[PDB]
Write a protein that binds this DNA or RNA. Structure first.
Ligand code: MG
Ligand code: MG
Ligand code: MG
Ligand code: MG
Ligand code: MG
Ligand code: MG
Ligand code: MG
Ligand code: MG
Ligand code: MG
Ligand code: MG
Ligand code: MG
Ligand code: MG
Ligand code: MG
Ligand code: MG
Ligand code: MG
Ligand code: MG
Ligand code: MG
Ligand code: MG
Ligand code: MG
Ligand code: MG
Ligand code: MG
Ligand code: MG
Ligand code: MG
Ligand code: MG
Ligand code: ZN
Ligand code: ZN
Lengths: 169, 107, 117, 186, 109, 292
RNA sequence: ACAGGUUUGGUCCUGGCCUUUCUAUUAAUUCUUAAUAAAAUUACACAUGCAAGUAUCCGCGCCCCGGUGAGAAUGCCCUCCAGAUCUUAAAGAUCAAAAGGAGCAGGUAUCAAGCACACCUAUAACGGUAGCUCAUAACGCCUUGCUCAACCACACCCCCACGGGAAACAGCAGUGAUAAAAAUUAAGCCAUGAACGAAAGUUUGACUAAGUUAUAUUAAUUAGAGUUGGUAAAUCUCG
């Protein structure tokens, strides 16, 4: 895209690439950030780059942002229990905020890998269906089997009307 | 490009197609070229081609005659570049024009 | 869709290119169509004998029994199939077709030697 | 049928040079974009139609799996995939014959294609398992027993049979059922 | 352990839009949505009524809504849980001091 | 004793024997190309990148498991003669369950003979190949493995390709696997082409089949002609590990051993053509006194 | 789009229109045979024959398949499950009504306001507040099946069927009228699926195998149609 001042962040590639996934407890996330100060600087970047990464990967988590309410910048987190997490981001680097969040409510790499494997096991090689869900379809295809008459017309013997006209006579 | 000897190229043209502006444009552009040697020289670093077919193998193309810098270069999570909406639209599978993927005769 | 009733049923859906039948073993609702919706696919069956002279049957025994354990019903040809494999005891009607066929073959031997005479 | 010959001929070497076949050939068509697949066949019976393909305008060319020097120039050198007819300009018939040709060519290895490094099928191969290793054959097998008592035909009590006839009396079809044991026939 | 609400709303935060009813707060929620053409995130808003014992919500409040286990009315599925920022009086979660905007009213020391 | 391919000695010696050639390891492939990616690097970054390369190349280089042959498995699970009279062609019952190791799958058959037989090995494999299609494998055996096609592919010096074909198509414990691998080794031996498979992951199979065929000839000759002493060293070392008790082994070991003494004593005690070794083992030696 | 033709005496620039690619009906001109897929103008009216039976009573089945796209901006997606049925040593399983909501969802703002569309009392059906929706498109109007291993909706019409018009093929074949739109008043339950059966088994216009049709691919036995100023392959003589 052309318009926008960091257009690379309106990509799909930039969206998939951001990594934080949230635990199942997180529901709401509240970013309170500040416009004017040097000590705000990191937080801002986080909103401007990382917030749109985060959200994409967690489409069900409300992410809200307030400006200039509180004189010092922070994150809040509202979990399922009624647990309220409070993450102070001040002189932090943008990267530091990201990784800190990942630490606190993340998902272990193993967790993700497990889950994706548990979904990948759902589509089984051996079934037969429409090209959408399966690979192979009619078993026209597989080598040793019979060729399906569209491609390779069948023996006079195996036709219905051959059997019919033979059983009649 | 057959007269230059360029055998592989993708080129799309936008706006007015008038012949003269086109050839002038093309020639300005292909003389606008920055060579690997020149890139190397201005940045004083090695330039390294990563082929996909050859895997991770880090082929060197160019070396900075004179002093090779001892300085690594900034890796931004966020590069700032002009991005053409057409390339990015291509990237995500959003070019659906029936004319595009056509078979055409040889070069 | 929403139905009045019916049971979970394991059976043979027929995909085929016509004169070349083939089947997909399927865990379905009784009240859905033959080739329509199902819960889960289980196996396949290929009636027509291949290059090697074999009739291929794939079955997921783990899942098949997961559903019978949930009380799915078997169609009679799925039971012929499960019979042969030995996952299930041979089906009574198989044996009866055996006896019938043997008796007719003996009667036809006697017809053969009564026509020869 | 001998392939190699015409590709090394002085006639060929004169005509085509070291450029591929089809190089100079050009397919005439209605506009800027040619129809997405070329003509069905350029030969029907004794008649050669219009401006013929590279392959069929020259009859001395033979499409086989044998001549690699002919089939080579219809495959992309770097990509190792064949060209669709329009790239080249061959007719559909000769193009299907060319695909099928390159296939048997690669099946006899007369040609190169890319062969990837594949790992072994299995990770841990243990021949030990009971599916692989012959089991302890059934106690029912050792005796020569039918696997269940009901595989065996048992002639029923005369009581049950006559009461059975007594049930169905008007509709009964009664013919002896001992199951002759050996199958084969004329 | 069964107390549930079939609604995905389970916990939200929104501004307090209006007080016009008895012991019921009109609260606007705003979530980010990815506009697929542009690939950008915009603020989509949605209003939720909520229930209040104290009738404690001034307009403009940043409020935490909790899903209610059994819905009161067609239009009330929530209960105000906590006031996150009462308007015009905001006490910094970090330092626990009274503040306006960028400035502390009573500083450390 | 217990020597085998997967022993650490045999492994580290066969990795060192094989060698890292980043040009032959990573080579242009015929797949549809993409435009090349470029980046500017430091000396440091290029070194780290180089090591990264070498690390990844090792994984490419990992040896295909060698194994002994499998015996035919014939066992009948049941017999009912009553079914036999059905006179229907063979039925093949496969289990497809996603959790199972493919040697732990159950593959069964009922013939027209009214018996329940387990699947043969080839049969079993082509079954799993049907329902668990894996790339490169034909479900019916590919023509190219006929002797004619074999010789044709050898002529073209493609041997890496053939050995890469069997890895995918057959199974490492199969009959055909062994027939083709071993016959192919015979070819590189009679043609002296050994340096082909050098940087290949196939090298381990070269070394083994030969140590166990006890013809080390061409590989030693070649190694000394290629100016590689250390490889011939570790190779004789290997013949000593896979032949601990023999005249050559215990004698040329316990007497004394190093490059000159062990390579020349195993050049005298392996007589296939000891005249070849002794010739070349002179030449390299001479070519040292001129270079030093 | 790899683009091409076309504004002017001419040149750029802006800017429509058209060509060139692929699919589908229908028509005209031609047409040899197979095989395979597909078959369709019409919620207009319907002659006749059939499309549910099973079974020792009772029971169970009897728009389930099958047909259609008339209706409705319908709905996709996601929560949560009453009920029905199946299995069974009481808890599993399959459908899943109602009710909901993160988000996505036809055109039109010359449709801009709608007109009670809210809440509070748990007192136990009365009282109390004065609200709710809406320019991030309420409320209208217009057109419409669909996001398709399927899902939604209808079943002569009056959204709904008590009652009223009135006597219903939008099951299979067929037929009038209508429309640019044309398949057999065909044979079998032999396979599958379904309903009943304790069972052999019985029924099934589902389906199976056919029949008709250049409608599309494939193979050959089949040669014809269109073009020939330019874009755009290709021309001589007459009138
Ligand atoms: Mg003008
Ligand atoms: Mg003019
Ligand atoms: Mg003028
Ligand atoms: Mg025009
Ligand atoms: Mg027509
Ligand atoms: Mg329907
Ligand atoms: Mg439909
Ligand atoms: Mg309509
Ligand atoms: Mg409407
Ligand atoms: Mg609307
Ligand atoms: Mg529901
Ligand atoms: Mg108007
Ligand atoms: Mg009142
Ligand atoms: Mg009605
Ligand atoms: Mg009535
Ligand atoms: Mg009607
Ligand atoms: Mg009809
Ligand atoms: Mg009806
Ligand atoms: Mg009519
Ligand atoms: Mg029609
Ligand atoms: Mg009938
Ligand atoms: Mg038909
Ligand atoms: Mg046709
Ligand atoms: Mg004719
Ligand atoms: Zn098929
Ligand atoms: Zn041709």
């Amino acid at each position: 895209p052309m318009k926008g001042r960091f257009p690379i962040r309106r990509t799909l590639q930039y969206l998939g690439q951001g990594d934080v996934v949230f635990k199942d407890s997180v529901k709401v996330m509240t970013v309170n950030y500040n416009t004017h100060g040097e000590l705000g600087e990191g937080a801002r970047k986080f909103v401007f780059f990382n917030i749109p990464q985060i959200q994409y990967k967690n489409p069900w988590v409300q992410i809200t942002m307030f400006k200039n309410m509180t004189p010092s910048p922070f994150l809040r987190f509202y979990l399922d229990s009624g647990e309220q997490v409070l993450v102070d981001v001040e002189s932090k680097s943008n990267k530091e905020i990201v990784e800190h969040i990942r630490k606190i409510l993340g998902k272990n790499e193993e967790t993700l890998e497990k889950e994706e494997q548990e979904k990948k096991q759902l589509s089984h090689p051996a079934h037969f269906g429409p090209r959408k869900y399966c690979l192979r379809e009619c078993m026209c295809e597989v080598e040793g089997q019979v060729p399906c008459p569209g491609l390779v017309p069948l023996p006079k013997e195996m036709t219905g009307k051959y059997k019919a006209a033979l059983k009649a006579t | 490009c057959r007269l230059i000897g360029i055998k592989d190229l993708y080129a799309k043209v936008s706006g007015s197609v008038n012949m003269l502006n086109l050839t002038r444009g093309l020639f300005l552009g292909l003389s606008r070229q920055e060579t690997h040697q020149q890139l190397a020289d201005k940045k004083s670093l090695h330039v390294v081609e990563f082929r996909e077919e050859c895997g991770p193998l880090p082929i060197v193309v160019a070396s900075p005659q004179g002093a090779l810098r001892k300085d690594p270069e900034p890796e931004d999570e966020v590069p700032d570049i002009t991005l053409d909406w057409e390339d990015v639209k291509a990237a995500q599978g959003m070019k659906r024009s029936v004319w595009s993927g056509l078979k055409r005769a040889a070069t | 869709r929403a139905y009045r009733g019916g049971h979970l049923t394991i059976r043979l859906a027929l995909g085929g290119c016509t004169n070349r039948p083939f089947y997909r073993i399927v865990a379905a609702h009784s009240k859905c169509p033959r080739d329509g919706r199902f819960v889960e696919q289980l196996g396949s069956y290929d009636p027509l004998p291949n290059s090697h002279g074999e009739k291929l049957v794939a079955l997921n025994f783990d899942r098949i029994r997961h559903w019978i354990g949930c009380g799915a019903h078997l169609s009679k040809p799925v039971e012929k199939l499960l019979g042969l494999s030995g996952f299930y005891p041979l089906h009574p009607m198989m044996i009866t077709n055996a006896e019938r066929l043997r008796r007719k073959r003996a009667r036809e031997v006697l017809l053969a030697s009564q026509k020869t005479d | 049928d001998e392939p190699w010959k015409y590709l090394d001929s002085e006639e060929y070497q004169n005509r085509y040079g070291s450029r591929p076949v089809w190089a100079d050939y050009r397919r005439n068509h209605k506009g800027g974009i040619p129809p997405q697949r070329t003509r069905k066949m350029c030969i029907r019976g004794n008649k050669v139609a219009g401006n013929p393909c590279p392959i069929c305008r020259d009859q001395k060319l033979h499409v086989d799996f044998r001549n690699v020097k002919l089939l080579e120039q219809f495959v992309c050198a770097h990509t190792g995939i064949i060209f669709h007819a329009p790239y080249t300009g061959v007719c559909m018939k000769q193009h299907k014959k060319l695909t099928q040709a390159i296939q048997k060519a690669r099946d006899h290895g007369l040609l190169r294609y890319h062969i990837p490094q594949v790992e072994p099928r299995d990770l841990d191969f243990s021949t030990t398992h009971g599916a692989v290793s012959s089991t302890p054959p059934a106690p029912t097998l050792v005796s020569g027993d039918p696997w269940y008592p009901w595989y065996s035909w048992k002639q029923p009590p005369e009581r049950e049979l006559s009461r059975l006839r007594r049930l169905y009396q008007g509709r009964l079809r009664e013919e002896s059922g001992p199951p002759p044991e050996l199958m084969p026939e004329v | 352990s069964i107390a549930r609400s079939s609604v995905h709303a389970k916990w939200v935060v929104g501004k307090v839009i209006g007080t016009a009813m008895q012991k019921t707060a009109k609260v606007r929620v705003t979530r980010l949505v990815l506009d697929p053409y542009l690939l950008k995130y915009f603020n989509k808003r949605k209003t939720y009524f909520a229930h209040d014992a104290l009738q404690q919500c001034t307009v403009g409040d940043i409020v935490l809504l909790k899903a209610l286990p059994v819905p009161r009315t067609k239009h009330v599925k929530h209960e105000l849980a906590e006031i996150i920022f009462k308007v015009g009086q905001v006490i910094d979660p970090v330092t626990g001091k009274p503040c306006a905007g960028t400035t502390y009213l009573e500083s450390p020391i | 004793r217990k020597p085998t391919f997967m022993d650490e000695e045999v492994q580290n010696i066969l990795i060192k024997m094989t060698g890292l050639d980043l040009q032959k390891i990573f080579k242009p492939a015929l797949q549809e190309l993409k435009p090349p990616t470029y980046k500017l690097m430091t000396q440091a970054q290029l070194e780290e990148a180089t090591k990264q390369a070498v690390e990844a190349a090792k994984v490419r280089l990992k040896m295909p498991p060698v194994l002994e042959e499998r015996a035919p498995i014939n066992d009948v699970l049941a017999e009912d003669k009553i079914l036999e009279g059905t006179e229907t062609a063979k039925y093949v019952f496969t289990d497809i369950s996603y959790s199972i190791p493919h040697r732990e799958r159950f593959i069964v058959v009922r013939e027209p003979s009214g018996t329940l037989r387990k699947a043969s090995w080839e049969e079993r494999d082509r079954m799993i190949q049907v329902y668990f299609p894996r790339e490169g494998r034909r479900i019916l055996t590919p023509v190219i493995f006929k002797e004619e096609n074999l010789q044709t592919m050898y002529s073209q010096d493609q041997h890496v390709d053939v050995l890469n074909l069997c890895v995918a198509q057959f199974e490492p414990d199969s009959a055909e696997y062994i027939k083709i691998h071993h016959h192919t080794y015979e070819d590189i031996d009679k043609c002296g082409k050994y340096d082909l498979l050098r940087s290949t992951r196939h090298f381990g199979g070269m070394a083994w089949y030969f140590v166990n065929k006890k013809k080390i000839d061409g590989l030693l000759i070649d190694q000394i002609q290629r100016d590689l002493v250390s490889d011939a060293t570790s190779l004789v070392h290997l013949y000593h590990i896979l032949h601990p008790x023999x005249x050559x082994x215990x004698x040329x070991x316990x007497x004394x051993x190093x490059x000159x003494x062990x390579x020349x004593x195993x050049x005298x005690x392996x007589x296939x053509x000891x005249x070849x070794x002794x010739x070349x083992x002179x030449x390299x030696x001479x070519x040292x006194x001129x270079x030093x």
